[PDB]
């Protein structure tokens, strides 16, 4: 029923289908990461260890990572955040010295984290939370108390308690703790932590699929 050229066109379409399936198989086995944070949250350090969207590709222990730095987009987040609905995890950054800085900056980071974690597109998406510049926090806590940022705080102004309090403050913004996990990390160690977090996420997703988790 088909002519010779029609049959050749069908053959070309079949070859295109083959190439598309191969590309999909190749992409299906790649870990996709969305990198978020404030304007000065230290995510530059994260990318360094590892005009619009910036894509960073790296491989670690046989895992291929697609990390998406979308901080350059000054447009409305609401209009394109759904493009990343399928990312395995989100890497969120917040410089820990922000507590006593102004655009308050810590509170802006908490607002962004609240709006991202509880987003309808990321209900089941785990979050890797990086609390960067801990060394600066160690020095600055000796002068500026953490209560300047969190009036309700009353613990001794030392690194351990203050950093733990900040971590608790950020992790408390998770309004869906049952379905979503947050992997906090103070900061080759960060790439190792990301590898561990994403492999745990993948294992748990697989177990959910097979009815074990």
């Amino acid at each position: 029923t088909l002519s010779a050229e029609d049959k050749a066109a069908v053959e070309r379409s079949k070859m295109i289908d083959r190439n598309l399936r191969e590309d999909g198989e190749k992409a299906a086995r790649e870990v996709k990461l969305l990198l978020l944070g404030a304007g000065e949250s230290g995510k530059n350090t994260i990318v360094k260890q590892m005009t619009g969207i910036v894509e960073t590709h790296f491989t670690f222990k046989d895992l291929h990572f697609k990390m998406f730095d979308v901080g350059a987009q000054r447009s409305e987040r609401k209009k394109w955040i759904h493009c990343f609905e399928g990312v395995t995890a989100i890497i969120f950054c917040v410089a820990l010295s922000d507590y006593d800085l102004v655009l308050n900056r810590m509170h802006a980071s908490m607002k962004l984290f609240d709006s991202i974690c509880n987003n309808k597109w990321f209900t089941d998406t785990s979050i890797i939370l990086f609390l960067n510049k801990k060394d600066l926090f160690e020095e600055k806590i000796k002068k500026s108390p953490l209560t300047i940022c969190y009036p309700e705080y009353a613990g001794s102004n030392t690194y351990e308690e203050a950093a733990a309090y900040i971590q608790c403050q950020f992790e408390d913004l998770n309004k869906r703790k049952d379905t979503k996990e947050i992997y906090t990390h103070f900061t080759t160690k960060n790439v190792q932590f990301v590898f561990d977090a994403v492999t745990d996420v993948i294992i748990k997703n697989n177990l959910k699929d097979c009815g074990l988790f």
């Binding site: 996990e181 992997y183 906090t184 990390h185 932590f193 561990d196 977090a197 492999t199 745990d200 294992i203 748990k204 177990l207 074990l212 988790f213």
Partner: peptide
């Protein structure tokens, strides 16, 4: 072996028990 690579994650006790 892969129960808790990050100490703060939820454990894999339920999958192991089901297995």
């Amino acid at each position: 072996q892969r129960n808790r690579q990050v100490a703060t994650a939820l454990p894999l006790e339920k999958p192991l028990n089901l297995v």
